[PDB]
Amino acid sequence: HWGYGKHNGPEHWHKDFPIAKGERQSPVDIDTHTAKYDPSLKPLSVSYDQATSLRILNNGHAFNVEFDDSQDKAVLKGGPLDGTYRLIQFHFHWGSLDGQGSEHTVDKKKYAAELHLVHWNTKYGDFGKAVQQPDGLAVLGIFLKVGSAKPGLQKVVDVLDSIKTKGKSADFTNFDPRGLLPESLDYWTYPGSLTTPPLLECVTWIVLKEPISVSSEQVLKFRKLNFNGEGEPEELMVDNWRPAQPLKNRQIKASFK
Ligand SMILES: CCCCNC(=O)c1cc(S(N)(=O)=O)c(Cl)cc1SC1CCCCC1
Ligand SMILES: [Zn+2]
Numbered sequence: 001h002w003g004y005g006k007h008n009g010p011e012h013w014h015k016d017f018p019i020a021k022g023e024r025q026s027p028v029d030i031d032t033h034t035a036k037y038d039p040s041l042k043p044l045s046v047s048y049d050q051a052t053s054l055r056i057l058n059n060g061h062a063f064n065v066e067f068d069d070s071q072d073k074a075v076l077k078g079g080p081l082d083g084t085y086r087l088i089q090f091h092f093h094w095g096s097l098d099g100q101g102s103e104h105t106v107d108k109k110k111y112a113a114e115l116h117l118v119h120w121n122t123k124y125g126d127f128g129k130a131v132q133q134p135d136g137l138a139v140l141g142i143f144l145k146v147g148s149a150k151p152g153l154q155k156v157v158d159v160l161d162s163i164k165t166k167g168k169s170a171d172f173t174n175f176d177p178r179g180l181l182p183e184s185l186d187y188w189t190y191p192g193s194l195t196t197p198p199l200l201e202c203v204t205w206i207v208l209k210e211p212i213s214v215s216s217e218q219v220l221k222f223r224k225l226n227f228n229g230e231g232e233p234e235e236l237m238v239d240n241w242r243p244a245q246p247l248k249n250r251q252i253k254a255s256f257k
Contacts, residue, residue: 002016003061003227004239010242010243013197013199017197017198019198019199019201020199024193024250025192025199026203026242027102027103027104027105027243027244028104028190028192028246028247029104029105029106029108029244030106030107031252032254034252035251036251036252036253037254037255037256038255041079041189041253042079043185043255044078044185045076046076046140046178046181046185047074047075047076048074048087048176050073051073051087051177051178052067052068052073052173053065053066053067053172053173053174053176053177054068054171054172054173056156056159056163056169056170056172057163057168057169058166058225058226060166060227061227061240062092062240063091063092063160063225064091065090065091065156065175066089067089069086069088074086075122079189079206079255080206081204085120085137085138087117087119087177088118088119088127089118090115090118091115092113092114092115092144093242094112094113094144094219094222094223094241095110095112095113095239096236098146098216099112100112100239101113101114101144101239101241102114103195103241103242103243104244106143111145111211112145112146113144113219113222114141114142114241115143116139116141116195117139117140118137118139119137119138121135121136121137131202132200132202134191134201134202135204137194137204138203138204138205139203140206141205142181142211142212143211143212144211144213144214145211145213146215146216146219147213147214148213149213149217149218150180150213150214150218152176152179152180153179153180153214155175157218157222160225163225164230165228165230165232166227166228166229167230180212181212182210182212183210184210185208185255186208186254187206187207187208187254187255187256188205188253189204189206189207189253190205190250190251191203191204191205191250192205192250196242209256222237223236223238224236225237227240
């Protein structure tokens with residue numbers, strides 16, 4: 001099955017998932033000089049006041065913090081989007097070292113990690129239908145750099161010991177994802193894809209310019225997770241990122257400057 005190594009990593013995905021070589025794959029390098037400022041783009045509206053986290057899951061590729069998406073409670077709107085997108089889950093991608101880990105890059109700079117808040121377009125009724133549509137998902141991507149701790153991240157970090165291995169989950173209620181956001185909502189946006197199999201070309205990407213800072217101790221806790229299940233040989237969950245893919249016939253737009 002697919003994963004992050006030499007024989008099952010990103011360079012192999014196209015044999016099971018030929019869209020890997022498609023026209024709107026993610027992530028991409030964000031060449032900041034070439035991105036054009038679009039005065040028609042709106043401020044992003046992030047409305048997370050009523051978010052209901054329920055659980056956290058080690059799915060063997062990353063960990064997902066899941067939300068109750070059965071009512072409009074945590075929604076993304078505005079920005080480049082038409083209509084309303086409901087938060088279903090967030091997860092991260094991170095490196096074995098602080099110098100790598102992000103999926104998107106900014107003028108070829110790789111951040112230590114990248115947070116993905118995944119939302120689906122309510123006009124398609126549920127996530128599984130949304131991923132079959134070119135405007136089905138909106139993913140808010142946020143870079144992480146290592147420096148000062150992110151206090152709003154600590155509840156996540158502290159539960160990771162309980163979900164060390166693939167298939168473990170834990171009650172994870174009352175987590176507020178507002179504590180993972182940077183000060184500015186200035187962003188870049190482009191049409192792309194899921195960055196994991198099945199690599200569906202269903203995502204409007206919204207990548208924030210301002211990274212959040214997390215501490216070395218926080219990211220070290222990410223790197224103690226395992227991609228294996230309990231009772232199997234230990235493979236640290238590190239370097240769970242797909243490299244930048246060809247931009248092809250796409251324009252990256254900036255909400256700023
Ligand atoms: C089997 C799932 C493997 C791990 N991937 C994800 O959790 C995932 C990653 C992204 S990303 N990295 O582009 O933000 C997005 Cl947008 C949606 C999904 S969940 C979804 C994938 C399609 C159908 C299965 C669940
Ligand atoms: Zn992701």
